[PDB]
Design a binder for this molecule. Structure first.
Ligand code: ANP
Ligand code: MG
Length: 752
RNA sequence: UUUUUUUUU
């Protein structure tokens, strides 16, 4: 851990993924990627008559009450009339004028209002009325920390402005964008805007950028703020709006050089808060029982429940479904429809929560229970929801500086997050929020506002992205909350060994290429260098499988058959190889002749994970074809098949290698020299003394997950920069026989 | 035996 200098061979020159990347960049230079399409817009004329940035509320309202659309040529529908009548009475509308009067005279502003006042929906439209996006050929961006948020609000606003979704108003998500060339109002995730910022540093396409729910302080959000602070210095024609329902606005104002704060009072509908007098021993059972209680007793309305993970959510779903059916049968309760909601679900299955409440034949109020993670915690309006059940728990990221690794842990939520969850109700109609914790806990136990992501997350990718933005001196760079210089330096070190950054500190073609991929830098470099080993398709598949949650299903009470079913796909010396076998068998014609989903439910495999993996693989394949990477493979008959795959794996995961103790028990890592063991779910039954691993996991003991045997020769060949003897501490178990391998190599060279 | 969220079809 006490690293210091150590001269080593040039990583950039010795890296095979770098050569692969030079090839890729050259091929990209040969056929330049097609430029963006200019934006299509109405030439306007009913807008003229006003000096720029001086739009009043009265004029905007006069344009609104008109029979024709100001931005399109369409005539207004009765739906638009009703929706207008509804939204004109929103608390945010009464302050419209003032908002304008600030937005016109300030370059950067902060906005704080009550939950469900109409911030995300009405503010960008106000911006549209003051600005001239169609005349100056620019777009306007509203940023949501969620996919579903952006999609849903895009739908709602599309209905509000009487435009077809995907035309003038649209959303852009990594798996699907509805943004065309006529799109003026663009809802998007912070990651998408970050990508557009990575391809275009100054974001010339946008004249006004809005960041909603900035209280979460996600990675992309903070990076975007840090960038925009400099962008505003370069171009004064850009305006930035920071929105949130709750915030420590002092930090934001002081960061953006004494920026103005607009706080709007007023509540659309009252949301009542209920606290438990005592502490709930088991939050899950408490959640289930309380949901069933609201189902049995409370008035008509749908229930929104928050939980931890997808496993817990599924369990809660089947339990609430069962006992709910028993409630309908024996106690004559109304029909109940439970819908799950988490990120790993397809957008359709996520959309399934907006379905109407069940019809009633008996007269008893039928209702819907939406069991979701914190994906619906921020900026999302469900029409049917009246009740909100909150255990007060979520899954958050924890990072150990000693180990330098990040994992997920169940943690108590924040005060802001609780105000958000409670703020999900009381929109369509007055809401009731049951919090499964004491008010004393809310006042003291709950954190003020969730620890920032930068201060938590590993910065191995963040640095690469920041470098892609065009930031040279990251140490001097203006963050809102600067991370630990130690972590930064070690990250730069990792990227230096991966040959993404040269010795001078600039971006290599390998880095510039690997930045475009939605992968962890190691996975990226691996994938890039894959086709040089003539096995890029297999490596692609493996990466896709590593990008998806655990495929294998293992029942608590039926472990034997599951372990056998896994042993069928199992391959000696390699977990990755086994994964490749699994996907190759899932995509096989035979598995389709059986029943795919049936076949997955016959071989103890997760269909959701497999289909998600197929999707991810398709995306990555499209990107590889876009940045001109050759899809290459070799015959199974060739003995260098497995060897090629292993080598390509080492190309990106050379820093994560373990060596078994010579004449002892357990393993030890090359990096940082830590005593470790092999995870029980690993296929390798024999003692391979040299292994490459994918995950580092701490539980009962320090375990190493997902491994594959490798020859030290290959490691020396691929990454000479990291495996020069000069880098590592004095005579330890690793170095002692590593030097023997070196003696071997030198004898080989000596004999020739 | 332990993937909340996000990252150009
Ligand atoms: N079908 C619908 N979809 C979305 N909103 C609806 C719908 N029907 C009625 N509304 C109302 O329109 C409002 C949408 O405005 P919204 O952008 O969600 O406010 P908000 O303040 O940004 N929410 P938040 O910032 O997370 O506290 C909702 O609060 C609802 O009251
Ligand atoms: Mg909002």
């Amino acid at each position: 851990k006490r690293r210091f200098s150590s001269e080593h061979p040039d990583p950039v020159e010795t890296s095979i993924p770098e050569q692969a990347a030079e090839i890729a960049e050259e091929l990209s230079k040969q056929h330049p990627l097609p430029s963006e399409e200019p934006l299509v817009h109405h030439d306007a004329g009913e807008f003229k008559g006003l000096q720029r940035h001086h739009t009043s509320a009265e004029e905007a309202q006069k344009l609104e009450d008109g029979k024709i659309n100001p931005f399109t040529g369409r005539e207004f529908t009765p739906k638009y009339v009703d929706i207008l009548k509804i939204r004109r009475e929103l608390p945010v509308h009464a302050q419209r004028d003032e908002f304008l009067k600030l937005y016109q005279n300030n370059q950067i502003m902060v906005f704080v209002g009550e939950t469900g006042s109409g911030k995300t929906t009405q503010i960008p439209q106000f911006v549209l009325f003051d600005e001239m996006p169609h005349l100056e050929n620019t777009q306007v961006a509203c940023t949501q920390p969620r996919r579903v948020a952006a999609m849903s609000v895009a739908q709602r606003v599309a209905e509000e402005m009487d435009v077809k979704l995907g035309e003038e108003v649209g959303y852009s998500i990594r798996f699907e964008n509805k943004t065309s060339n006529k799109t003026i109002l663009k809802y998007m995730t912070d990651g998408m805007l970050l990508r557009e910022a990575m391809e275009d540093h100054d974001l010339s396409r946008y004249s006004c950028i809005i960041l909603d729910e900035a209280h979460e302080r996600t990675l992309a959000t903070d990076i975007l703020m840090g960038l925009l602070k400099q962008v505003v210095k370069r171009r004064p024609d850009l305006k930035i709006i920071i929105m949130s329902a709750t915030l420590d606005a002092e930090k934001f104002q002081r960061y953006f050089n004494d920026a103005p704060l607009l706080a709007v009072p007023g509540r659309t509908y009252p949301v009542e808060l209920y606290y438990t007098p005592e502490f709930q021993r088991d939050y899950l059972d408490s959640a289930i029982r309380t949901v069933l209680q609201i189902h049995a007793t409370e008035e008509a309305g749908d229930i929104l429940l928050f939980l931890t993970g997808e496993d817990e959510i599924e369990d809660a779903v089947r339990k609430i479904s069962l006992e709910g059916d028993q409630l309908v049968r024996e106690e004559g309760c109304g029909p109940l429809s439970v819908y799950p909601l988490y990120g790993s679900l397809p957008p359709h299955q996520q959309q399934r929560i907006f379905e109407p409440a069940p019809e009633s034949h008996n007269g008893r109020p039928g209702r819907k229970v939406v069991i979701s993670t914190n994906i619906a915690e921020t900026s999302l309006t469900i029409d049917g929801i009246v009740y909100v059940v909150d255990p007060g728990f979520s899954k958050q990221k924890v990072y150990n500086p000693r180990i330098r690794v990040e994992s997920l842990l169940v943690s108590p939520i924040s005060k802001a997050s609780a105000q958000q969850r409670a703020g999900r109700a009381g929109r369509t109609r007055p809401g009731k929020c049951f919090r499964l914790y004491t008010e004393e806990a809310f006042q003291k136990e709950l954190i003020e506002q969730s620890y920032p992501e930068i201060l938590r997350s590993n910065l191995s990718s963040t640095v690469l992205e920041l470098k892609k933005l065009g930031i040279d001196d990251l140490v001097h760079f203006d963050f809102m909350d600067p991370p630990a210089p130690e972590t930064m330096m070690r990250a730069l070190e990792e990227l230096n060994y991966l040959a993404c950054l040269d010795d001078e500190g600039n971006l290599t073609p390998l880095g510039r290429l690997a930045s475009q991929f939605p992968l962890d830098p190691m996975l990226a470099v691996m994938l890039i260098g894959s086709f040089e080993f003539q096995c890029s398709q297999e490596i692609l598949t493996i990466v896709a499988m590593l990008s998806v949650p655990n495929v294998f299903i293992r029942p608590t009470k039926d472990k034997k058959r599951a372990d056998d079913a896994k042993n069928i796909f199992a391959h000696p010396d390699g977990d990755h190889i086994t994964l490749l076998n699994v996907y190759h068998a899932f995509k096989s014609d035979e598995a389709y002749e059986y029943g795919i989903h049936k076949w997955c439910r016959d071989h103890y495999l997760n269909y959701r994970s497999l289909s998600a993996a197929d999707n991810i693989r398709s995306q990555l394949e499209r990107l590889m074809n876009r940045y001109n990477l050759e899809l290459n493979t070799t015959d199974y008959e060739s003995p260098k098949y497995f060897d090629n795959i292993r080598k390509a794996l080492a190309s990106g995961f050379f820093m994560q290698v373990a060596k078994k103790r010579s004449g002892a028990k357990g393993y030890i890592t090359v990096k940082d020299n830590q005593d470790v063991l092999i995870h029980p779910s690993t296929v390798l039954g024999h003692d391979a003394e040299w292994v490459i691993y994918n995950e580092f996991v701490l539980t009962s003991k320090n375990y190493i997950r997902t491994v594959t045997s490798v020859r030290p020769e290959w490691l020396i060949e691929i990454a000479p920069a990291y495996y020069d003897l000069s880098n590592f501490q004095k005579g330890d178990v690793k170095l002692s026989l590593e030097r023997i391998k070196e003696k071997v190599d030198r004898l080989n060279e000596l004999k020739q």
